[PDB]
Ligand binder design. Structure first.
Ligand code: CL
Ligand code: CL
Ligand code: CL
Ligand code: NA
Ligand code: NA
Ligand code: NA
Ligand code: NA
Ligand code: NA
Ligand code: NA
Ligand code: NA
Ligand code: NA
Lengths: 275, 100
């Protein structure tokens, strides 16, 4: 139904050791499709999905220009920010930018995002209406005044409500094989006797796409959130995902415990039992 | 000044069956800052040919990488992932456990 495009930029200062590291990556939904790495040989934006390879040389030339331009502005911002926060010259700091657009089920513009972090903290971010800014701290308030005065948001809104969405629709149809699929998780539970008196029950979901999933345990139907170990959904490496959730229970009580799995590729929510 | 500790998972792409080729993964997520050292180990020794994904990050700005290589699981061979990061006082080693 609905889909997203995101770019993610990461700049990292290494003072005296040369210029910053700059890495830019593009995604449609959970599928990466481009990279740029400023320390790489090629100095090009590169394809990372099969369906992007058909784009012609204007695309690749254009995206390389744009991303190198971004790398330059982050290079400048690293200096500015170190200034504003009164930090020493010699130490490594990080800027991060993400932006992108969401489209709805009929592939119409739904939402835009444009936001910045400095040393892993929100810095400034476009508000949902794409006309205002959210700045917490004083440095970013200063940035806000400047960007309000230069009308930065209307330029970003234009991209987000137009160009961004046009490219996403194009990618959705050219990468229909990969992007317009749903792979239901292959599910099961494992039991391992840690000792005589207790057992680890682990609920597995494998080989699924997209990444979004919910795994929950219940004991006699009662949610077991606080006693659940839930690992981060993780790439299998073949364009599908994996995830598990575990509970440690008293030997003999296994039949009280049920696993519940929710995914887009499942016709109905799935309950797994010890039975 | 913010730091976030890596969450480390070591796992096969497919269900492991001894003597059949597979792919051995070490996923590291939830870390900040991005400078990280990740090796795959075979019987406590560094594996040389390993590839990794392009640096990206999650909505909370924490970073994630996948490190991977082709392997053939066997009965006798042990695999692990070794990680160092500013947040770890000593390198963390997580063993591959195929029975989980
Ligand atoms: Cl770009
Ligand atoms: Cl943490
Ligand atoms: Cl398993
Ligand atoms: Na691109
Ligand atoms: Na700035
Ligand atoms: Na940052
Ligand atoms: Na498909
Ligand atoms: Na069911
Ligand atoms: Na069901
Ligand atoms: Na912190
Ligand atoms: Na682990």
């Amino acid at each position: 139904g609905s889909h997203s495009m995101r770019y993610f930029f990461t700049s990292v200062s290494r003072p005296g050791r040369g210029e910053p590291r700059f890495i830019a990556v593009g995604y449609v939904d959970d599928t990466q499709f481009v990279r740029f790495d400023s320390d790489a040989a090629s100095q090009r934006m590169e394809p990372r999905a099969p369906w992007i390879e058909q784009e012609g040389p204007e695309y690749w030339d254009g995206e390389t220009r744009k991303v190198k331009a971004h790398s330059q502005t982050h290079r400048v911002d690293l200096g500015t920010l170190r200034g504003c926060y009164n930090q020493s010259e010699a130490g490594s700091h990080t800027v991060q930018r993400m932006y992108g657009c969401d489209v709805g089920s009929d592939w119409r513009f739904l939402r835009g995002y444009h936001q910045y972090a400095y040393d892993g903290k929100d810095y400034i971010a476009l508000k949902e209406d794409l006309r205002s800014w959210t700045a917490a701290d004083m440095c970013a308030q200063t940035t806000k005044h400047k960007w309000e005065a230069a009308h930065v948001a209307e330029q970003l809104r234009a991209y987000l409500e137009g160009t961004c969405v046009e490219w996403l629709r194009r990618y959705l149809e050219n990468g229909k094989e990969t992007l317009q699929r749903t792979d239901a998780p292959k599910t099961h539970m494992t039991h391992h006797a840690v000792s005589d008196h207790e057992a680890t029950l682990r609920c597995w979901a494998l080989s699924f796409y997209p990444a979004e999933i919910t795994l929950t345990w219940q004991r006699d139907g009662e949610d077991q959130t606080q006693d659940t170990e839930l690992v981060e959904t993780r790439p299998a490496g073949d364009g599908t995902f994996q995830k598990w959730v575990a509970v440690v229970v008293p030997s003999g009580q296994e039949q009280r415990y049920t696993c519940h799995v929710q995914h887009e590729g499942l016709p109905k929510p799935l309950t797994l039992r010890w039975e | 000044m913010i730091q976030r500790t890596p969450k480390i998972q070591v796992y096969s792409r497919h269900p492991a069956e001894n003597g059949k080729s597979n792919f051995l993964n070490c996923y590291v997520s939830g870390f900040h800052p991005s400078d990280i050292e990740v090796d795959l180990l075979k019987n406590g020794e560094r594996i040389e040919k390993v590839e990794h994904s392009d640096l990206s990050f999650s909505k909370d700005w924490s970073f994630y990488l996948l490190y991977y290589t082709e392997f053939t699981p066997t009965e006798k061979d042990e695999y692990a992932c070794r990680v160092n990061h500013v947040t770890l006082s000593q390198p963390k080693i997580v063993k591959w456990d195929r029975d989980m």
